[PDB]
Amino acid sequence: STAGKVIKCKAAVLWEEKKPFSIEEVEVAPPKAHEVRIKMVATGICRSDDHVVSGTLVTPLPVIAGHEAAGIVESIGEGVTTVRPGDKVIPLWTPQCGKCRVCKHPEGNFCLKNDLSMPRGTMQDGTSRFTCRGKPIHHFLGTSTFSQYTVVDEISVAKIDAASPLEKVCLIGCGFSTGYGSAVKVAKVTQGSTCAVFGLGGVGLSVIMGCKAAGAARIIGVDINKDKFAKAKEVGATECVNPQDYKKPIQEVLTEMSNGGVDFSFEVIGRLDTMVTALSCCQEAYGVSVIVGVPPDSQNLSMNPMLLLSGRTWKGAIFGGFKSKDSVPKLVADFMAKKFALDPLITHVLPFEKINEGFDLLRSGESIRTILTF
Ligand X SMILES: NC(=O)c1ccc[n+]([C@@H]2O[C@H](COP(=O)([O-])OP(=O)([O-])OC[C@H]3O[C@@H](n4cnc5c(N)[nH+]cnc54)[C@H](O)[C@@H]3O)[C@@H](O)[C@H]2O)c1
Annotated catalytic residues are 46, 48, 51, 67, 174
* 319 is known to lie in a ligand binding site: yes
| Total length of the chain | 374
* 228 is known to lie in a ligand binding site: yes
Q: Which one, 319 or 374, has the nearer CB to ligand X?
A: 319
Selection from 155, 163, 228 nearest residue 197 by Cα: 228
Determine, following the binding rule CB under 8 A, whether residue 81 of this chain makes contact with a second copy: no
Cβ contact 234:251 at 8 Å: no
Q: What is the dihedral of CA 68, 73, 79, 82, to 10 degrees?
A: 70
Specify the stretch interacting with ligand X by CB under 6 A; choose among 1-9, 43-51, 71-79, 118-126. 43-51
CA angle (70 as vertex; 230, 45 as ends), nearest 5: 45
Q: Which one, 26 or 157, has the nearer CB to ligand X?
A: 157
* 201 is known to lie in a ligand binding site: yes
Q: Which x/- pattern over 192-211 shows residues binding ligand X (rule: CB under 6 A)?
A: ------xxxxxxx-------
Q: Which residues pair with 218 in a beta bridge?
A: 194
Residue 368 CB neighbours (<10 A): 24
Nearest distance from C-beta of residue 347 to a second copy, angstroms: 26
From residue 182, alpha-carbon distances to 119, 174, 177, 210 in Å are: 23, 12, 8, 8
The correct pick among 3, 6, 217, 285 for binding a second copy (CB under 8 A) is: 285
Q: Which one, 117 or 364, has the nearer CB to a second copy?
A: 117
Cβ contact 265:282 at 8 Å: yes
The correct pick among 269, 276, 279, 355 for binding ligand X (CB under 6 A) is: 269
Which of the listed partners (Zn ion, ligand X, a second copy, none) does 315 bind, with a CB threshold of 5 to 8 Å by partner kind? a second copy
Cβ contact 125:109 at 8 Å: no
Cα 307 to Cα 113: distance, rounded to the nearest angstrom: 34
Cα 26 to Cα 305: distance, rounded to the nearest angstrom: 50
Determine, following the binding rule CB under 8 A, whether residue 93 of this chain makes contact with a second copy: no
Which of the listed partners (Zn ion, a second copy, ligand X, none) does 302 bind, with a CB threshold of 5 to 8 Å by partner kind? a second copy
Q: Which one, 67 or 231, has the nearer CB to Zn ion?
A: 67
Determine, following the binding rule CB under 6 A, whether residue 175 of this chain makes contact with ligand X: yes
Which residues here bind a second copy, judged by CB under 8 A?
Answer: 101-102, 105, 107-110, 112, 117, 259-260, 272, 275, 283-286, 291-292, 294-295, 298-306, 308-318, 321
